[PDB]
Design a protein around this ligand. Structure first.
Ligand SMILES: C[N+](C)(C)CCO
Ligand SMILES: C[N+](C)(C)CCO
Ligand SMILES: C[N+](C)(C)CCO
Ligand SMILES: C[N+](C)(C)CCO
Ligand SMILES: C[N+](C)(C)CCO
Ligand SMILES: C[N+](C)(C)CCO
Ligand SMILES: C[N+](C)(C)CCO
Ligand SMILES: C[N+](C)(C)CCO
Ligand SMILES: C[N+](C)(C)CCO
Ligand SMILES: C[N+](C)(C)CCO
Ligand SMILES: C[N+](C)(C)CCO
Ligand SMILES: C[N+](C)(C)CCO
Ligand SMILES: C[N+](C)(C)CCO
Ligand SMILES: C[N+](C)(C)CCO
Lengths: 292, 293
């Protein structure tokens, strides 16, 4: 008869000398035994999902499968029972000490949030739940890292695109966000915008690649723009000190040389500053920079 | 005839209505005038190089050749004279206020190090000089950025590889370096190593991609290794307190299950701990963990 056997501090499932390895259902509960030694596993594990005839029985004699199940993160209690969790869970963090351990091995505790799918393994990557997006860490097991599933907070970079997850809820943010004394615009997909952004009729410039909203004079594509303190791109006449500048009515680019506004001709030097009360090119201009 | 003319504080170079634009040699010295307005430039400028028939004369029959010369960083004196610098120079930092100004425009100065090539523009990127490598800032003019040429210091990422430049001198460092409480190995080309690195017979492991040297137990490439406190990879029998582990003699990877060393069989549990004075899968092992046949 199949039975649990305690040997050398470890637990095995044996019938005679015959050892179970991989998954087995025992009294309706799921257990898992190390592929090589049969040692029963406890706590966090990154192991093959149960797949008939390779990682869970029956193993009918004869013809072999090629291939092998992908691994997933599962959580087993201190006695080896697979915890069949489904929602959000608060559980211990995954470290060298808390991952891949066997019953009877010699073990401050920290916690975070994880989300279990219907098959009782961890979700990783983007998750839509209760009308919001969340980001759960991608699995990376290397060196001292045992990452995978942890609900993330703050900035994340997915496929070279930046997203912000609220640190308190894990919820992916959209819209204008104020962070580290600066403004960012997250598109309705959550994606951090860079470059020119139009909201209603107002234009904004978000740093490429940093995303932060620019204010003041910006040289962009070899043109000068003035962005107001609010980030809004200025158009028309703008007075900086006692100096006047003209920014193109539609596009916002600063004019230099001779230009006409309301059937008047004005002249701006290379700096963009309006020539006033003087002569330029033989043409007098008045106190309003009108050609007179 | 051709002459400098002042109006509205600005300087132009004109013959009647005709205004010089771009580059011109005047009494053996080089000046440059804004392409649109003819205003003479001063200070730092990022502008096309003098290319005969395009941006410097002669222009036979007034014709300008097609296309447009590559732009470079030049330094003009306050009187418009191009400063024909070569080699290292300490000059004001490049900002909004200090780049692209024209003679007659109204502007604690901050200074930094630059290197001029033989054609009197800034060198950017890798420079070998005085038997050392230096990294000069790549050109990036956009928004508020007017970068290019500045001698860089500290960690820099160039084309996917990290290099470290001394903070005081800018000299590219090589070899083992203890920086911010971690060891890094910089290869003889200066490139920061990641992954396994062998010096002599000892192996070391440097974090990929951050470069810091690892110590302790590390799970790498689906095997366990023990890196001593010097970073050197342990091989053979290793004792931690009571527990014994066997690390593959050459490769260093920890054994589990049954293995053979010096014609004796040994067994390690899944943790790597050697089984001793016990029975394992029906086999007897002695106090040395040796299988007793
Ligand atoms: C909504 N998101 C962009 C966050 C998911 C994309 O796959
Ligand atoms: C959000 N980024 C990380 C893009 C910049 C933040 O400062
Ligand atoms: C862009 N801000 C959020 C800075 C202002 C108005 O929306
Ligand atoms: C250059 N902007 C994008 C600011 C305006 C275009 O219409
Ligand atoms: C504006 N200018 C005076 C140069 C010409 C107008 O037609
Ligand atoms: C930036 N400009 C010189 C172009 C305008 C005001 O300072
Ligand atoms: C300079 N302008 C005449 C254009 C504006 C005066 O208020
Ligand atoms: C610093 N080096 C030139 C030697 C390396 C790569 O460019
Ligand atoms: C820049 N490195 C990646 C080497 C480490 C910085 O802290
Ligand atoms: C420089 N060594 C790598 C020899 C020791 C570092 O800790
Ligand atoms: C895995 N190591 C790189 C240390 C051993 C190879 O020979
Ligand atoms: C090496 N041993 C015989 C001890 C193990 C066989 O499975
Ligand atoms: C060999 N291991 C890392 C698995 C044991 C450390 O204590
Ligand atoms: C001699 N070994 C190193 C085999 C282990 C002894 O307990």
């Amino acid at each position: 008869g199949w039975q649990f056997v305690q040997e050398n501090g470890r637990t095995y499932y044996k019938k005679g000398d015959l050892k179970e390895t991989y998954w087995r259902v025992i009294d309706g509960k799921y257990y898992y035994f190390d592929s090589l030694s049969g040692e029963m596993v406890v706590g966090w594990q990154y192991i093959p999902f149960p797949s008939k005839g390779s990682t869970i029985g029956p193993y009918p004699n004869g013809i072999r499968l090629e291939g092998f199940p992908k691994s997933e993160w599962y959580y087993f209690d201190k006695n080896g029972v697979l915890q069949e969790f489904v929602g959000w869970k608060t559980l211990e963090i995954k470290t060298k000490d808390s991952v891949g351990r066997k019953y009877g091995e010699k073990r401050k505790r920290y916690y975070t949030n994880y989300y279990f799918n219907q098959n009782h393994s961890l979700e990783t990557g983007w998750l839509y739940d209760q009308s919001n997006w969340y980001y759960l860490a991608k699995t990376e097991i290397n060196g001292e890292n045992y990452l995978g599933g942890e609900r993330r907070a703050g900035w994340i970079n997915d496929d070279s695109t930046w997203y912000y997850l609220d640190p308190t809820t894990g919820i992916m943010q959209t819209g204008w966000q104020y962070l580290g004394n600066k403004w960012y615009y997250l598109r309705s997909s959550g994606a951090m915008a860079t470059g020119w952004y139009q909201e209603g009729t107002t234009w904004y410039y978000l740093d490429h690649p940093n995303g932060d909203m620019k204010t003041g004079w910006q040289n962009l594509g070899n043109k000068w723009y003035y962005l107001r303190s609010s980030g809004a791109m200025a158009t028309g006449w703008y007075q900086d000190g006692s100096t006047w500048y003209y920014l193109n009515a539609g596009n916002g680019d600063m004019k230099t040389g001779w230009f006409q506004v309301n059937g008047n001709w004005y002249y701006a030097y290379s700096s963009g500053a309006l020539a006033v009360n003087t002569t330029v090119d033989g043409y007098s201009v008045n106190y309003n920079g009108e050609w007179v």
